[PDB]
Amino acid sequence: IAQARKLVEQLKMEANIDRIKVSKAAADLMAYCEAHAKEDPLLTPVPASENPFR
Amino acid sequence: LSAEDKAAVERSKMIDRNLREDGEKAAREVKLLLLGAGESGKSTIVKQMKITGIVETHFTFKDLHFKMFDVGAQRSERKKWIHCFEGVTAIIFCVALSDYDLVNRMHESMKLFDSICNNKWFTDTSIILFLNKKDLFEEKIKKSPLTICYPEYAGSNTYEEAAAYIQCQFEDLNKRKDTKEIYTHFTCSTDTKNVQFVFDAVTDVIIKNNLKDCGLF
Amino acid sequence: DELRQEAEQLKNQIRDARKACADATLSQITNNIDPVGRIQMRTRRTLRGHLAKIYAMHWGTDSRLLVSASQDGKLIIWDSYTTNKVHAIPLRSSWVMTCAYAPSGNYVACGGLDNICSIYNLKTREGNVRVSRELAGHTGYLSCCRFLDDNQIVTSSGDTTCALWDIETGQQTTTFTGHTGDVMSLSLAPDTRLFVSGACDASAKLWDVREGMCRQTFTGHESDINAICFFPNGNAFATGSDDATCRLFDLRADQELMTYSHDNIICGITSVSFSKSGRLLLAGYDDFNCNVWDALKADRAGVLAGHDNRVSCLGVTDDGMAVATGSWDSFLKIWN
Amino acid sequence: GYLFLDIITYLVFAVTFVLGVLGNGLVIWVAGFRMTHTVTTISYLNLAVADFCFTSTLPFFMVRKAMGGHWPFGWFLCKFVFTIVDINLFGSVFLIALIALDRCVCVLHPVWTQNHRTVSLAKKVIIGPWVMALLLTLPVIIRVTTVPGKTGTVACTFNFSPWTNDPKERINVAVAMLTVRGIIRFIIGFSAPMSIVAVSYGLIATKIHKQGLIKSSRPLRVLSFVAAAFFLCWSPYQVVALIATVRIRELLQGMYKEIGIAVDVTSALAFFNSCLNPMLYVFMGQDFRERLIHAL
Amino acid sequence: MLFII
Ligand SMILES: CCCCCCCCCCCCCCCC(=O)O
Ligand SMILES: CCCCCCCCCCCCCCCC(=O)O
């Protein structure tokens, strides 16, 4: 029965968490993807003179 | 083209030759998974073989080297690690015959047997099946009726008929009756009889595997 | 007796809090962005030499070396640029479901049905690789293990417990209890202060490594969770499940943002990894081929076939140059 | 009256060339490149190259029969074609014997095939059929030559001891050399491989019937459809060849015109086995059948 | 194999 009270305590901290709007989180993920897009060899093919796997 | 990494390629080739030699020495050994239903029996058939994690028992019979993976210590979701044993030659499944009265234990053993026999990974893997404690079964069936576990059983409560009925119920759980054969055995105290049965069953499985590979079967 | 209704009320409250914070979906905000959906990756190397199913691979921070584990009992460290095998480590137990390569590169770890995480010292005065410490304290199998540094390794297990270990002492410094089902995967935050563990109970829990209490719990998967990987920010993570669905959970928003599903895909996901920018989600399905999900739009940007059996493990290099997918076919392929 | 026996020969060569090159190619491509190398598949690859190079060599035979024995290609091309044909045919027979012995050893003695039947031993063994094929093809390589004809035609007939130009001695020398080739044909290329195939496919059929391990008759059916096919394709030619090699003196003057067409039609039946080996070893295996459709 | 004559 200790598991039940322990789950109740854990679900208390999950409850009081300073959350942010999903719009802000989505904007942050989109902003990071745009910022690091150039330094990402997978999104845009890299020239063979710069690619170490040939 | 290669200057100081030529020796690196030489090391790569040397350790690849060592990987192949070890791989041949691993494929040489026949791998058996021992998915015992209960601690009972599973321990007994392990002692009857020549000799915390998963116990890997190594033994050799008639120039055939065996590996028995006693995975009973792995009490977790079998679905998430059962695919690790997809290529075992046979699944030695150990059942205690004297578990019908104990508690429903035999019903649990059948549930596990159905779970592994009709598994998506062991469709073509022969299941050796040991029905253990036949001695305790012989004494038990005298006083405790087998109708406790099987209401449908309609036969004289004698060891031969009752044991045959239990073997029939276990052997009837396989929906795939073509790609798999359930080699069943009532365990004899002699260590030689139990190992010989495993050797005979695995030689049959090796012959069938060769037939399937060669295209005959 | 009262605890059960209190827990149900708290679950309703947290669900209401998440619904309140979900002002808009990820798809609505990122509907106007460029659909980067032309992803063709040719296999640039085929690392061969494993004679059994490959269950785990991990890249080095140098993004050149990678350690791969397989059921023939061998950890092989590959110089992926030249396909050479730097080391071949004969494991004590062939049943290895996971492997990790230390960020420093000095050590490798591997564990599985043995319940033990073995730490191997690659750089020794002698020429052989020797096991430094066997971390034996788990009752359930080892599904994942990730090095935090040369001394701290976090290990998810199949007994519902994720553990934090001190390698020199060999004893758990923290046990992350709380999952109700077997934990199948781990993902360390880029800053190494947080790590998300996905379990068979379809719940992914964010944990804090410093004190060891579950910071957040994420649900939304129908079936078992097989793979998890933090977004390069560490403020989001993708999860791979047996229900043929990846989901992107954001840590701050504390709720699922995007669902990565396609009707023709009805097979479980065995591995998940993000691209260097996080714009690509590399999900390794068990339909024998990986997929490339555009993480911001949930449109399948590409496919990485070339593997005969299921893609068991997948990893993107720390510089994002290559994606090494290892499969039960005994062959690791590096893609670019 | 005998013109009919020629068109069937031309078609049997024609069907063998096209079906053989396409089918064996499939075996080489799928087994060699698409599939992993197991002992059984490498044995099939060896048989596939053995009966593929020979079928590729067949157009030379069709044209030679077309021009009444004229070999217009030259000297090197006759040396290479006849050398390749004998290496391959002798191999396309020793490898069938080796596959039969492999299927026999992997059923009669399963413990040995588990412990020692590895790809390493298999590749060591697969040279033995090729090495035997090359050593028994040396009479072709060291004696076969384009020989001029006073009739306005050129022929690929074996020339022995060109050192002795005695018309009488040449016939006497040839009868002897060709008898040796004949005995080696009916005691190494037919009797020994037929004996190995018959003993192997009889012993495995006997075991799988006594053990009762099989459920379907498909193993017995495949063993019969392979052993009988090998016997049906090669028994005609090896039989005619033996009667010819016991009547060679009379054949070297052209007197026995009949064997001339007997050797021709029956040899086409012997060559038919080379095209049907891919039809009968790899495409009756579902693993290969699935792999081929999925390969494209 | 082949009967050249
Ligand atoms: C066509 C004639 C038959 C094929 C040629 C011979 C086949 C090989 C026979 C010997 C195989 C190896 C025997 C020793 C094996 C061992 O080391 O245990
Ligand atoms: C211990 C006694 C063993 C007796 C039988 C040994 C048989 C050896 C010959 C095996 C031939 C086939 C082996 C694989 C070769 C191949 O097919 O490529």
Numbering used by the authors:
A (entry chain C): 9 to 62
B (entry chain A): 5 to 55, 182 to 233, 241 to 354
C (entry chain B): 5 to 340
D (entry chain R): 21 to 316
E (entry chain L): 1 to 5
What wording appears in the published article?
FPR1 is a high-affinity receptor for many short formylpeptides such as the prototypical formylpeptide fMLF (N-formyl-Met-Leu-Phe), while FPR2 prefers longer peptides or peptides with specific sequences such as the phenol-soluble modulin (PSM) family of formylated peptide toxins produced by Staphylococcus aureus. In the structure of fMLFII-bound FPR1, similar polar interactions among fMLFII and D1063.33, R2015.38, and R2055.42 of FPR1 are also observed. At the mouth of the activation chamber, F2576.51 of FPR2 is replaced by Y2576.51 in FPR1, which forms an additional hydrogen bond with the main-chain carbonyl of fMet1 of fMLFII. The side chain of Leu2 of fMLFII is surrounded by aromatic residues F812.60, F1023.29, V1053.32, and F2917.43 in FPR1 to form extensive hydrophobic interactions, while it only forms hydrophobic interactions with L812.60, V1053.32, and F2927.43 in FPR2 since F1023.29 in FPR1 is replaced by H1023.29 in FPR2. Those additional interactions between fMLFII with FPR1 explain the ~100-fold higher potency of fMLFII in activating FPR1 than does FPR2 as reported in a previous study. Consistently, our mutagenesis data showed that the mutations of Y2576.51 and F1023.29 in FPR1 to their counterparts in FPR2 resulted in reduced potency of fMLF in activating FPR1, indicating lowered potency. In FPR1, our structural analysis suggests that the side chain of R842.63, which corresponds to S842.63 in FPR2, sticks towards the peptide-binding site and contributes to the positive charge potential of the FPR1 ligand-binding pocket. The electrostatic potential-switching mutation R84D reduces the potency of fMLF in activating FPR1, indicating an important role of the positive potential in the recognition of short formylpeptides by FPR1. Compared to them in FPR2, the extracellular loops ECL2 and ECL3 in FPR1 are positioned closer to each other, resulting in a less open extracellular region. The narrow extracellular opening of FPR1 may restrict the access of long formylpeptides, therefore at least partly accounting for the preference of FPR1 against long formylpeptides.
